[PDB]
């Protein structure tokens, strides 16, 4: 069985396993690819890292609008671009 070991999580994964790796004050979405080299690919392209937190696609959060009169609700869209959008509450 081909595996990947992640030195941060301390776990051994099989090919195709996905998992979270907290690092750099963010959360990386990692995949054990293997490829005969214990190849791991990790990405934040489908997370939003905003207001010091890590959000998955569909997660929401709040931040004040620049005018200060009202709050925004934001949602993480991802789109391989860490895309998020916010509407007034």
């Amino acid at each position: 069985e081909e595996t990947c070991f992640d030195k941060y999580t301390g776990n051994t994964y099989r090919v195709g396993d996905t998992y979270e790796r907290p690092k750099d004050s963010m959360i990386w979405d990692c995949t054990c690819i293997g490829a005969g080299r214990g190849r791991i690919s990790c990405t934040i392209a489908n997370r939003c890292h905003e207001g010091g937190q890590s959000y998955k696609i569909g997660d929401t959060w709040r931040r004040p609008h620049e005018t200060g009169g009202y709050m925004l609700e934001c949602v993480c869209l991802g789109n391989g671009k860490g895309e998020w959008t916010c509407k007034p509450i």
């Binding site: 990947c4 080299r37 214990g38 190849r39 690919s41 934040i44 392209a45 609008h65 895309e83 998020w84």
Partner: peptide
Amino acid sequence: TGMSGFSETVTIVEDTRP
């Protein structure tokens, strides 16, 4: 009245057994 943006967008590939 709203706001939108893009977070840091990075992909890392590591060969743990090169």
